[PDB]
Structure formats: C-alpha cells, structure tokens
C-alpha cells in the first residue's frame, strides 16, 4: 500500500494512541465490533444500523480507505455516537467513551 498523506499519518498516530496501553482502562470496549448475541443486546442492531469500532478504523486506514482526515474523524465520532446513542447515559461505558473521545477531539484538533 501507498504512504499514507501527512494529515493521515497524523490520524494514524491518534488511532494508535486510542489502542495503546495508556488508554486502556477506558477504551478496550472499543477495541473490536459490538458482539451483540454474546452480550444478549438484543436490540442492538435495531438501533444502530452503522456499528463502528477500532479496529475497523484501522482495517480502514490499514488499507487506505480513508480519502482525507474527516473521513477519519467522521468513523470515530461515529463510534462514540453509536455508544452514546444505543446505552443508557448513566452507564459506564458512557462515561468510558467520553474519556476516550476528550483524548480524540484534543489530538484531532491540535494537528498540523
Ligand atoms: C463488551 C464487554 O465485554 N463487557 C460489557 C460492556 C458492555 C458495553 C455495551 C456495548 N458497547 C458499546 C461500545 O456501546
């Protein structure tokens, strides 16, 4: 595969912070695709009709799908959105995803 741009090799950088083990305590719900029949989330796949995690957004990038940093972001804040939106507010892997989503838009917004 070709050289990521200078903007992607910034995101890849974030996406590699999100997996390592710094951030950890609050991202490994993140880590992998929702399995929604070993959790018993019944509901699911009615309520979030595009799951995204991590390692999706790494196949991604791993594979040069992203056109430009926004696509990037988009899948990203598309996770967060996904956890926001199927759980209750007061669970904690809300509380899990806002953490891990301070260090996303802090990262994001600081690239050059
Ligand atoms: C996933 C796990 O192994 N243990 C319990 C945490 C449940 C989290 C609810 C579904 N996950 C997201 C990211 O919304």
């Given at each position: 595969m070709g050289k990521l741009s200078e903007h992607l090799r910034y995101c890849d950088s974030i996406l590699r912070e999100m997996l390592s083990?710094?951030?950890?305590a609050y991202a490994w719900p993140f880590?992998?695709?929702?399995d929604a029949e070993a959790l018993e989330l019944h509901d699911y796949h009615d309520i979030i009709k595009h799951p995204m995690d991590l390692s999706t957004v790494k196949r991604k990038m791993d594979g040069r799908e992203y056109p430009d940093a926004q696509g990037f972001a988009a899948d990203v804040r598309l996770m967060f959105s996904n956890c926001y939106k199927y759980?209750?507010?007061?669970?904690?892997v809300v509380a899990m995803a806002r953490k891990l989503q301070d260090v996303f838009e802090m990262r994001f917004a600081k690239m050059p």
């Open positions: 083990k710094k951030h950890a880590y992998k695709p929702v759980n209750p507010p007061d669970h904690e």
